[PDB]
């Protein structure tokens, strides 16, 4: 008899909290507009998830980026594929250690790959292209961070199918890693979550399945490549969501510790990622906004699921 | 002391014990991972890690499963987070045998400000140092590596800390499924029982080796 009045008090409070949550962000009837991503970026956020993935494809290399194209008026290479995985991991280290003057620390990973097309004629066969999925599938994994709206690099890793083949076959004396081989033995797929498309407005209605097509363009080209059976080991290596991919990338080198590098290499790496590659402080500040907005969107579905659970109990009891 | 309908499952060698309940078509599953480093005293007064467990409340009439991140302190119970998963209690959802549950899902808001109240006491938290790569040397461990711990929200503190009057109704809602203070008094006493039997078996194995 007490189960009905408890489940009805919760289902009424969750409906009251979801009602009071919408009217806070609503301004004069129209709901809260999400923050806009930068030019060319297409963000996909799965429903009921902790992360959101955005992609960007620079045709004809770096020279078609945003900063290299703005000029003063009124007076080939391989294409680059960007991918910024952004989880909801945001904390402040000034709570646990008051000596650290950091207000906000938000981690997000950047995966940049390159793909050779058939139209480039100038420098085709003068050297074997190592960025090609047919030859190594070399890809740069830049772990990034935002320390008080200032983008700081955490690590720069260069991963290929070689060190994915090395970890599965000969990372030990004659065998692979015993934990990396066991983590690949327990790989169950996640249920399909419907993704929401918070794209750039200019590319919102032009093409929809473009980050899906470039994800399956590389997955075909890597699985039927020079390295065939080591692509499931490379998928878990490049899997940015979970603890199995973080342990797998920690078995690789992890790059040099960046504050020990030269000051000329530190500024040239920041000039490449911000200026040349396009992964900017505008993109870095947008990720801190989009981690806040989509956390708010996931709180409302959490309030909708408290009410949905509490109503299903009271109608049963 | 023991709750009414709960079977215990503890094998020597693993620092885990799992409690299961079933009333009607609903199933209640409580999983605990005992810390090997040091756990706090039952009297509480005088590195002293709290006893943190999880409670899985599966209700097939609703179609969702409620995972409750709970912390037992002084025999009583606080609830730190509540998340919802699809379908019934699958075997993959429980973090037994060091394989985690579902990854990359929304963890939930803060139901209570217990972690902010511990820093007024200056109790040492789970996060030892600021550097996450420093604590990632002992990977796949919840107590010494909080940056990949499911029970510690992977180091993330969420945006919303839920309203007291709202989340008081959520804590009363879970107490009818056996997530009351009577369970947390048993989990507090059984974690101290596992911590003695694991340390005694590890010592006597070490005596015969040398």
């Amino acid at each position: 008899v007490s189960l009905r009045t408890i489940a009805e008090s919760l289902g009424a409070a969750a409906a009251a909290e979801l009602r009071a949550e919408v009217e806070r962000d609503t301004r004069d009837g129209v709901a809260a507009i999400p923050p806009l991503p930068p030019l060319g970026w297409r963000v996909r956020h799965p429903s009921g998830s902790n992360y959101f993935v955005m992609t960007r494809t620079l045709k004809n290399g770096v020279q078609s980026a945003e900063l290299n194209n703005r000029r003063y008026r009124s007076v080939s290479r391989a294409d680059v594929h960007l991918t910024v995985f952004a989880p909801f991991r945001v904390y402040d280290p000034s709570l646990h250690d008051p000596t650290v003057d950091i207000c906000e620390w938000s981690s997000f990973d950047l995966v940049v790959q390159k793909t050779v097309p058939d139209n480039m004629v100038a420098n085709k066969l003068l050297q074997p292209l190592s960025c090609t999925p047919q030859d190594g599938a070399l890809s740069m994994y830049v772990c990034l961070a935002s320390v008080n709206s200032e983008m700081r690099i955490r690590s720069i890793q260069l991963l290929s199918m070689k060190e994915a083949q090395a970890l599965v076959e000969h990372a030990c004396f004659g065998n692979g890693e015993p934990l990396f081989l066991e983590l690949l033995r327990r790989r169950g797929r996640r249920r399909p979550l419907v993704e929401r498309r918070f794209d750039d407005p200019r590319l919102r209605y032009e093409e929809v399945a473009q980050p899906q097509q470039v994800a399956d363009e590389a997955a075909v080209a890597c699985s039927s490549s020079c390295y065939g059976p080591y692509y499931p080991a490379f998928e878990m290596l490049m899997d940015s969501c979970g603890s199995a991919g973080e342990y797998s990338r920690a078995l690789c080198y992890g790059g040099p510790y960046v504050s020990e590098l030269s000051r000329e290499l530190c500024d040239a790496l920041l000039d490449y990622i911000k200026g040349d590659l396009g992964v900017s402080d505008q993109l870095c500040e947008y990720v801190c906004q989009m981690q806040f907005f989509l956390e708010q969107e996931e709180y409302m579905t959490w309030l909708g699921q408290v009410q949905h659970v509490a109503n299903a109990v009271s109608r049963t009891a | 002391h023991l709750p009414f309908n709960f079977d215990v499952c503890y094998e020597l060698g693993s620092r885990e014990f799992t409690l299961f309940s079933s009333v009607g078509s609903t199933s209640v599953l409580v999983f605990c991972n005992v810390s090997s480093r040091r756990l706090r005293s039952v009297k509480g007064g005088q590195d002293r890690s709290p006893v943190v467990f999880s409670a899985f409340v599966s209700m097939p009439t609703s179609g969702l499963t409620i995972e409750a991140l709970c912390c037992s302190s002084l025999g009583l119970l606080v609830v730190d987070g509540v998340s919802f998963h699809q379908g019934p209690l699958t075997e993959s959802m429980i973090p037994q045998d060091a394989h985690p549950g579902p990854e990359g899902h929304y963890q939930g808001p803060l139901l209570n400000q217990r972690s902010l109240a511990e820093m007024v006491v200056n109790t040492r938290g789970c996060i030892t140092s600021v550097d996450p790569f420093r604590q990632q040397e002992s990977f796949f461990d919840g107590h010494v590596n909080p940056w990949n711990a499911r029970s510690l929200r992977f180091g993330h503190v969420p945006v919303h800390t839920a309203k007291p009057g709202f989340s008081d109704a959520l804590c009363h809602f879970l107490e009818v499924f056996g997530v009351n203070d009577e369970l947390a008094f048993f989990v507090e006493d059984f974690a101290h029982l596992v911590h003695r039997e694991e340390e005694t078996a590890w010592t006597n194995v070490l005596k015969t080796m040398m």
Partner: peptide, 16 residues
């Protein structure tokens, strides 16, 4: 319409 969206996405399931 948000509760309409979560039932279509599957966040609010039916009876199992």
């Amino acid at each position: 319409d948000k509760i309409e969206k979560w039932k279509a996405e599957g966040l609010l399931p039916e009876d199992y």
